[PDB]
């Protein structure tokens, strides 16, 4: 009889499964309702090429990463660890199909207990692109506290209100429509690990959104290079300041705007700066090396 009401409690368990299934159904229903400092340091540190799988990974899969790593994934993790260690924003340019997400999740779980490094990291992503990336984040790191940013303006505002709090959760996220609705709401905290991807094809990149993408507050920032950064002034000298903040020139103090001819010469000096800042962080190579 004990086994019998344990059976009835097991039908309670299947009722719980019904509750979870209805919660996923309601997920669908609501979704329907819905100068060269960092440069030189990265040149020295970031292992690349033959040093993409064979290096000194002095920080492997952390305690909080309940998942494995590819050798070059471990190396990206180690480079990110040093990158924060040296107060650096850095680009993680592991080619797509090689698992940038594994490196980023491992770095989220590693930039952690020790310093207790807890700013709700970040990932700047698309509304549609947030889903799979967050799925991976919780897959490899089901322990790291995370917060999502997609939903009704009520839910989005509630999430935004709790972003300013430091140590609140490991990882923060942001889409790009709510970026229209959250333009200056993402420059709040000096996030301990900021990450930018998909910024390239953001709709309506107005000067508003230009800047808001540019000078997000961070104690660290990351970037994913699906394709090497581009020969457009704004985006990439941002990516540079991003890479080299705290410089003698505050970002909004941009030295001459527009690519005029004289501004083209000043921009060629800035392009020397540009290449030197961007190259060190491009761990970009084909599957052939590290398939």
């Amino acid at each position: 009889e004990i086994e019998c009401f344990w059976s009835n409690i097991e039908q309670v368990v299947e009722i719980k499964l019904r509750v979870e299934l209805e919660e996923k159904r309601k997920k669908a229903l609501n979704l329907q309702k819905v100068i060269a400092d960092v440069t030189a340091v990265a040149e020295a540190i970031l292992p690349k090429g033959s040093a993409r799988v064979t290096t000194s990974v002095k920080f492997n899969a952390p305690s909080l990463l309940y998942g494995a790593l590819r050798d070059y994934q471990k190396i990206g993790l180690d480079w990110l660890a040093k990158l924060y260690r040296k107060n650096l924003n850095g680009i993680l340019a592991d080619e797509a199909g090689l698992g940038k997400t594994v490196q980023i999740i491992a770095f989220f779980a590693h930039l952690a207990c020790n310093e207790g490094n807890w700013g709700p990291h970040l990932v700047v992503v698309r509304s549609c692109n947030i889903l799979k990336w967050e799925l991976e984040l919780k897959r490899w790191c089901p322990g790291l506290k995370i917060l999502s940013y997609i939903g009704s303006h009520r839910e989005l505002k509630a999430k935004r209100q709790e972003w300013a709090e430091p140590n609140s959760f490991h990882v923060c996220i942001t889409s790009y429509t709510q970026f229209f609705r959250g333009l200056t709401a993402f420059t709040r905290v000096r996030w301990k690990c900021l990450v930018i991807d998909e910024m390239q094809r953001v709709k309506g990149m107005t000067e508003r959104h230009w800047e808001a993408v540019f000078t997000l507050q961070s104690q660290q920032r990351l970037l994913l290079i699906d394709s090497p950064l581009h020969n457009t002034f704004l985006e990439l000298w941002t990516m540079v300041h991003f890479l080299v903040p705290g410089i003698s020139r505050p970002y909004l103090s941009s030295p001459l705007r527009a690519p005029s001819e004289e501004s083209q010469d000043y921009y060629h000096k800035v392009v020397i700066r540009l290449h030197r800042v961007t190259q060190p962080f491009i761990l970009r190579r084909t599957k052939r090396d590290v398939e």
Binding site: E1, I2, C4, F5, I9
Partner: protein, 324 residues
Amino acid sequence: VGALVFDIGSYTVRAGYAGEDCPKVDFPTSPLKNGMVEDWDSFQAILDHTYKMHVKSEASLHPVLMSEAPWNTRAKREKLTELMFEHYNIPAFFLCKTAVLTAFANGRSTGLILDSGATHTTAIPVHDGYVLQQGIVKSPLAGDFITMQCRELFQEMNIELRSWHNYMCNCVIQDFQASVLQVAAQMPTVHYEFPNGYNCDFGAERLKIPEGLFDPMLGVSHVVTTSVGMCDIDIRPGLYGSVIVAGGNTLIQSFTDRLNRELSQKTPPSMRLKLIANNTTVERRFSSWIGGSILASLGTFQQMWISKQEYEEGGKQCVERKCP
């Protein structure tokens, strides 16, 4: 006709319906000094006081279930069924061990139970819903002992710590325990105030008083580790991963915690020893009543009681036959 489930525990009586979560009446119990009915008339009277004053319902209507001590003697059970059916004329009856209900309250049939009441703290390993009488270990280092330490440690403080004053005298030493007693070595302490306002800086007394049950006689850890020794050989791993605690007397700060350490360092480290943390007073105080309330409610309870019928066809003998 909602089934009534009463706990007649040594120091308080927990009473209520099967379908309700809480015993609607929890009042002080005495005719249960050793653990079983010492005074049948006083026992019968307090039961009478229960049906009429505590629940305001005749016993003749609702089905009734009573819980009894694991180590109790049979003669108590035969007489209880004799007294209960004859006097109250209930339609259906049942008897279950308090330890069994706790394991039922904790939703874990196979387990080991630690509880304490008036004068007694015991260890009872239950397998497959069956109490192993041979495995039971009964110790005197109950809550009363610790409170008696409190009372003496209050008398040495020379505070002014008819029967009601004794009830007050006993009530306070228990109330002090919950607030203060935790298991110079204690650093600055609480400022607990008596109703009249008297108090003191209750220092190491909060740490030394609880230590008696571990070291005043068999400590609680010794009570249990031996109990499993006395039981079967191969089920012992099951008990260790299923140890439970119940009883208001077990409500001391870091009590369950210190128990985990004492056992973790006494059991083989390889063992999967685990404690189920029903440490809340409400959990502990209700644990026995909860199991009984669950038991009566179920749809197979409809065949498990000793109906009034069984008692006409057979006398006291049914108790040993229907209740494990």
